[PDB]
Amino acid sequence: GHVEDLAAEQNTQITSIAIGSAEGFNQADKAINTAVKSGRWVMLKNVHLA
């Protein structure tokens, strides 16, 4: 919530993404690939299960 409201105040939309699901790894991979060339904030939630 802290970084969520921080991004909201900064008015920069973010991609909150889970990690637990099997699709989550691929989703985060493409999110990183598409954000490093655009300047967006990728957010991965509870990334400790992998």
Tab-separated table of N, CA and C in Angstrom:
chain	number	residue	atom	x	y	z
A	1	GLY	N	0.795	-1.215	0.000
A	1	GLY	CA	0.000	0.000	0.000
A	1	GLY	C	0.829	1.267	0.000
A	2	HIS	N	1.977	1.250	0.683
A	2	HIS	CA	2.816	2.442	0.756
A	2	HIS	C	3.286	2.867	-0.629
A	3	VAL	N	3.913	1.947	-1.362
A	3	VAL	CA	4.391	2.271	-2.699
A	3	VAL	C	3.222	2.479	-3.652
A	4	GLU	N	2.090	1.815	-3.408
A	4	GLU	CA	0.918	2.032	-4.252
A	4	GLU	C	0.440	3.477	-4.160
A	5	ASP	N	0.269	3.986	-2.936
A	5	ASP	CA	-0.153	5.374	-2.781
A	5	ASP	C	0.939	6.339	-3.221
A	6	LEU	N	2.209	5.957	-3.068
A	6	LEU	CA	3.291	6.799	-3.567
A	6	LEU	C	3.217	6.953	-5.081
A	7	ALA	N	2.997	5.848	-5.795
A	7	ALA	CA	2.852	5.916	-7.245
A	7	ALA	C	1.603	6.693	-7.633
A	8	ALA	N	0.521	6.532	-6.866
A	8	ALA	CA	-0.693	7.295	-7.141
A	8	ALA	C	-0.446	8.793	-7.013
A	9	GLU	N	0.256	9.208	-5.954
A	9	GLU	CA	0.595	10.619	-5.792
A	9	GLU	C	1.514	11.092	-6.910
A	10	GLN	N	2.502	10.272	-7.273
A	10	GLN	CA	3.378	10.580	-8.395
A	10	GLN	C	2.649	10.534	-9.733
A	11	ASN	N	1.434	9.982	-9.767
A	11	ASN	CA	0.630	9.881	-10.987
A	11	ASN	C	1.320	9.036	-12.050
A	12	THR	N	2.038	8.007	-11.612
A	12	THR	CA	2.667	7.041	-12.500
A	12	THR	C	2.033	5.679	-12.271
A	13	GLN	N	1.290	5.200	-13.264
A	13	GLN	CA	0.631	3.910	-13.135
A	13	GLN	C	1.649	2.775	-13.197
A	14	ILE	N	1.370	1.725	-12.429
A	14	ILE	CA	2.306	0.640	-12.173
A	14	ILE	C	1.625	-0.690	-12.469
A	15	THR	N	2.432	-1.730	-12.672
A	15	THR	CA	1.925	-3.072	-12.948
A	15	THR	C	2.177	-3.956	-11.731
A	16	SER	N	1.187	-4.012	-10.845
A	16	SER	CA	1.252	-4.933	-9.719
A	16	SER	C	1.013	-6.357	-10.207
A	17	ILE	N	1.979	-7.239	-9.959
A	17	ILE	CA	1.968	-8.586	-10.517
A	17	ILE	C	2.326	-9.584	-9.423
A	18	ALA	N	1.570	-10.678	-9.351
A	18	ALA	CA	1.871	-11.749	-8.414
A	18	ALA	C	2.972	-12.652	-8.969
A	19	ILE	N	3.497	-13.520	-8.104
A	19	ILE	CA	4.632	-14.362	-8.467
A	19	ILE	C	4.275	-15.831	-8.260
A	20	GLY	N	3.318	-16.092	-7.367
A	20	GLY	CA	3.008	-17.467	-7.005
A	20	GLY	C	2.552	-18.314	-8.179
A	21	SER	N	1.731	-17.742	-9.057
A	21	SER	CA	1.187	-18.498	-10.176
A	21	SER	C	2.278	-18.849	-11.184
A	22	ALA	N	2.049	-19.943	-11.917
A	22	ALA	CA	2.991	-20.357	-12.953
A	22	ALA	C	3.055	-19.337	-14.085
A	23	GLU	N	1.915	-18.739	-14.436
A	23	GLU	CA	1.901	-17.672	-15.430
A	23	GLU	C	2.599	-16.412	-14.926
A	24	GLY	N	2.744	-16.272	-13.607
A	24	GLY	CA	3.307	-15.054	-13.050
A	24	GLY	C	4.727	-14.784	-13.506
A	25	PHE	N	5.543	-15.835	-13.632
A	25	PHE	CA	6.927	-15.645	-14.066
A	25	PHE	C	6.977	-15.015	-15.452
A	26	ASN	N	6.223	-15.586	-16.396
A	26	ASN	CA	6.170	-15.047	-17.749
A	26	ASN	C	5.565	-13.648	-17.780
A	27	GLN	N	4.508	-13.421	-17.000
A	27	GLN	CA	3.895	-12.101	-16.966
A	27	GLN	C	4.894	-11.052	-16.500
A	28	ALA	N	5.619	-11.339	-15.419
A	28	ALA	CA	6.643	-10.416	-14.947
A	28	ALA	C	7.770	-10.254	-15.960
A	29	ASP	N	8.131	-11.327	-16.671
A	29	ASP	CA	9.199	-11.231	-17.663
A	29	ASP	C	8.853	-10.238	-18.764
A	30	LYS	N	7.676	-10.398	-19.377
A	30	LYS	CA	7.241	-9.415	-20.370
A	30	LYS	C	6.992	-8.034	-19.768
A	31	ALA	N	6.532	-7.944	-18.516
A	31	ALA	CA	6.363	-6.620	-17.924
A	31	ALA	C	7.701	-5.901	-17.822
A	32	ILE	N	8.740	-6.615	-17.390
A	32	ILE	CA	10.075	-6.032	-17.320
A	32	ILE	C	10.557	-5.638	-18.710
A	33	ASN	N	10.367	-6.522	-19.696
A	33	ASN	CA	10.853	-6.233	-21.044
A	33	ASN	C	10.173	-5.004	-21.639
A	34	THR	N	8.869	-4.845	-21.405
A	34	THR	CA	8.137	-3.715	-21.962
A	34	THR	C	8.249	-2.448	-21.124
A	35	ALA	N	8.780	-2.529	-19.902
A	35	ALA	CA	8.883	-1.341	-19.065
A	35	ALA	C	10.254	-0.681	-19.115
A	36	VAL	N	11.321	-1.454	-19.336
A	36	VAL	CA	12.662	-0.885	-19.371
A	36	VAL	C	12.890	0.033	-20.562
A	37	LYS	N	12.067	-0.069	-21.602
A	37	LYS	CA	12.166	0.806	-22.759
A	37	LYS	C	11.140	1.929	-22.735
A	38	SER	N	10.369	2.061	-21.657
A	38	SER	CA	9.306	3.055	-21.605
A	38	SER	C	9.383	3.901	-20.337
A	39	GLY	N	9.958	3.351	-19.270
A	39	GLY	CA	10.113	4.102	-18.039
A	39	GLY	C	8.959	3.950	-17.070
A	40	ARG	N	8.435	2.733	-16.960
A	40	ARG	CA	7.346	2.413	-16.053
A	40	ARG	C	7.874	1.633	-14.852
A	41	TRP	N	7.093	1.632	-13.774
A	41	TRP	CA	7.483	0.981	-12.525
A	41	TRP	C	6.800	-0.380	-12.456
A	42	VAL	N	7.577	-1.438	-12.660
A	42	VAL	CA	7.078	-2.799	-12.490
A	42	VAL	C	7.111	-3.146	-11.008
A	43	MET	N	5.992	-3.645	-10.495
A	43	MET	CA	5.869	-4.058	-9.101
A	43	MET	C	5.585	-5.554	-9.057
A	44	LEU	N	6.452	-6.302	-8.385
A	44	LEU	CA	6.198	-7.712	-8.138
A	44	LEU	C	5.840	-7.924	-6.675
A	45	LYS	N	4.723	-8.603	-6.439
A	45	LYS	CA	4.239	-8.845	-5.091
A	45	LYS	C	4.802	-10.152	-4.553
A	46	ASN	N	5.091	-10.149	-3.246
A	46	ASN	CA	5.545	-11.296	-2.460
A	46	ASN	C	6.457	-12.232	-3.243
A	47	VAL	N	7.534	-11.693	-3.805
A	47	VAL	CA	8.440	-12.490	-4.646
A	47	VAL	C	9.442	-13.140	-3.698
A	48	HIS	N	9.010	-14.250	-3.103
A	48	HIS	CA	9.881	-15.081	-2.289
A	48	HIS	C	9.600	-16.564	-2.469
A	49	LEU	N	8.589	-16.932	-3.252
A	49	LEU	CA	8.243	-18.326	-3.484
A	49	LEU	C	9.045	-18.953	-4.613
A	50	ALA	N	9.842	-18.166	-5.332
A	50	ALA	CA	10.639	-18.647	-6.459
A	50	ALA	C	12.067	-18.144	-6.306
